[PDB]
C-alpha cells in the first residue's frame, strides 16, 4: 500500500570499527536496506533479488562483515558504480519494478520517503528540493515506484548552492545486466 | 521512545482520530468542538479553530511525531483507520475520494481525523466523513492538507 519506513541503529562507532577489523558481525539482520559504514564513510545498501547492493564509490572492492567472517563481493562493475554481496541472513529483498511508472520515491538513511519525478533513464528531480547535508549518507538507497518496487539505486546528487534538485541513479536493469 | 503520528482520541461521548502534521495535532470540529486536549500539565487550548472547514488543531502532544504534507500530487490515496487498517481510496476531486473496495459503515466508524496518505505515506488530508449508501461506505470526504497549511497564516 503506501511506502513507510523506519530506521534502527544497531552499532555505535566503537563497535563498528572493531567489526570492520574482525570482519565478524554476529548481530541479526532485518529489513530491505542496510545502513553501512567504512572507516571514512556511511551509506546505504539495498537488497534486491537476494543480493545486497551498493555503490562502488563507497564500498570499493571491500568485503562485508558477517556472522562467518568477511564476505567477498559477488558482483563488481566499476563503470556502473555498482557492487553486490549475497544478501545477509535475515534481510528481505525488494522486487524490481515492472510498471514503468515515472513517479519515484527515494528512501533516505533517515527513513524518510521523498517524491522524485523521473526525467530520463538514470535521472530524476526532487519535487521538494533538500539541503545536501540531508541526503548525506543516503547513496545506495532505493528509488521505489508507487507499488514499492525497486526502480533504481540513488548514485549521485545534483546540487546548486548546497541545495539538491535532481538525483542520478543506477536503474534496476543495470543490476540485472550486472547479474549476467 | 517510539513516536506515533496518529492519535486515538476520546470525548465523554464520541471516539475518533487526530493526525499530527507540521507540529500541530489536527482533528475534526465535529468530534472535538472547541474542547481543550488533555496533557499531564493540565488542559491545552486549541491553536486553531476553523469551524468552516471542520478543522481543529492543538500543539502536537508528547509521544507524537508529524507527518509531512504530500507534494507528489498523486491520486492513489490510503486511509488509515483507528484499527490501523489501510484502505486504498481513489481521489475524485478536491475533497472527495472513492474506496477501491467498499466497506460496511462500521469499518470506518471512529476514524475521522485520521490521515489520508499518498504512496509516499505523506499526508494528503484528514478523513472528514464517510459517504454512505445504506450501511455501505463507498467514498469519503476529507480536509485537504492545503486547508491545514493555509489555516496556519
Amino acid at each position: 500500500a503506501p511506502i513507510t519506513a523506519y530506521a534502527q541503529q544497531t552499532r555505535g562507532l566503537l563497535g563498528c570499527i572493531i567489526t570492520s577489523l574482525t570482519g565478524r558481525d554476529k548481530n541479526q539482520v532485518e529489513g530491505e536496506v542496510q545502513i553501512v559504514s567504512t572507516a571514512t564513510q556511511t551509506f546505504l545498501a539495498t537488497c534486491i533479488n537476494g543480493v545486497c547492493w551498493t555503490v562502488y564509490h563507497g564500498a570499493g572492492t571491500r568485503t562485508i562483515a558477517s556472522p562467518k567472517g568477511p564476505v567477498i563481493q559477488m558482483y563488481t562493475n566499476v563503470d556502473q558504480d555498482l557492487v553486490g554481496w549475497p544478501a545477509p541472513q535475515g534481510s528481505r529483498s525488494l522486487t524490481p519494478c515492472t510498471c514503468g511508472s515515472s513517479d519515484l520515491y527515494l528512501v533516505t538513511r533517515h527513513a524518510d520517503v521523498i517524491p522524485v519525478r523521473r526525467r530520463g533513464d538514470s535521472r530524476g528531480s526532487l519535487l521538494s528540493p533538500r539541503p545536501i547535508s540531508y541526503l548525506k549518507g543516503s547513496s545506495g538507497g532505493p528509488l521505489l515506484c508507487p507499488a514499492g518496487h525497486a526502480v533504481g539505486l540513488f548514485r549521485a546528487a545534483v546540487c546548486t548552492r548546497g541545495v539538491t534538485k535532481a538525483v542520478d541513479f543506477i536503474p534496476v536493469e543495470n543490476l540485472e545486466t550486472t547479474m549476467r | 521512545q517510539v513516536e506515533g503520528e496518529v492519535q486515538i482520541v476520546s470525548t465523554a461521548t464520541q471516539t475518533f482520530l487526530a493526525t499530527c502534521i507540521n507540529g500541530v495535532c489536527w482533528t475534526v470540529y465535529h468530534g472535538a468542538g472547541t474542547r481543550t486536549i488533555a496533557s499531564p500539565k493540565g488542559p491545552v487550548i486549541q491553536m486553531y479553530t476553523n469551524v468552516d472547514q471542520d478543522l481543529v488543531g492543538w500543539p502536537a502532544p508528547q509521544g507524537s511525531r508529524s507527518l509531512t504534507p504530500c507534494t507528489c500530487g498523486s491520486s492513489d490515496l490510503y486511509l488509515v483507520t483507528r484499527h490501523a487498517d489501510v484502505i486504498p481510496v481513489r481521489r475524485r476531486g478536491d475533497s472527495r475520494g472513492s474506496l477501491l473496495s467498499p466497506r460496511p459503515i462500521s469499518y470506518l466508524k471512529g476514524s475521522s481525523g485520521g490521515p489520508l496518505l499518498c504512496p509516499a505515506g505523506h499526508a494528503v488530508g484528514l478523513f472528514r466523513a464517510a459517504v454512505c449508501t445504506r450501511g455501505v461506505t463507498k467514498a469519503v470526504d476529507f480536509i485537504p492538507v492545503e486547508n491545514l497549511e493555509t489555516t496556519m497564516r
Binding site: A1, I3, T4, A5, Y6, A7, Q8, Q9, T10, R11, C16, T19, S20, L21, G23, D25, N27, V29, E30, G31, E32, V33, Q34, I35, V36, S37, T38, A39, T42, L44, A45, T54, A59, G60, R62, T63, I64, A65, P70, P88, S91, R92, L94, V107, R109, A111, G141, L144, G148 | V2, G4, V6, I8, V80, H83, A84, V86
Partner: peptide, 21 residues
C-alpha cells in the same frame, strides 16, 4: 583494508500499527 559493516537498517515492510502499552 576494513570490511563494510552494517551499523543499522531501514525497514520498508512494516505497516501501520497501534503502539502496544
Amino acid at each position: 583494508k576494513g570490511s563494510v559493516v552494517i551499523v543499522g537498517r531501514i525497514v520498508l515492510s512494516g505497516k501501520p500499527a497501534i503502539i502496544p502499552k
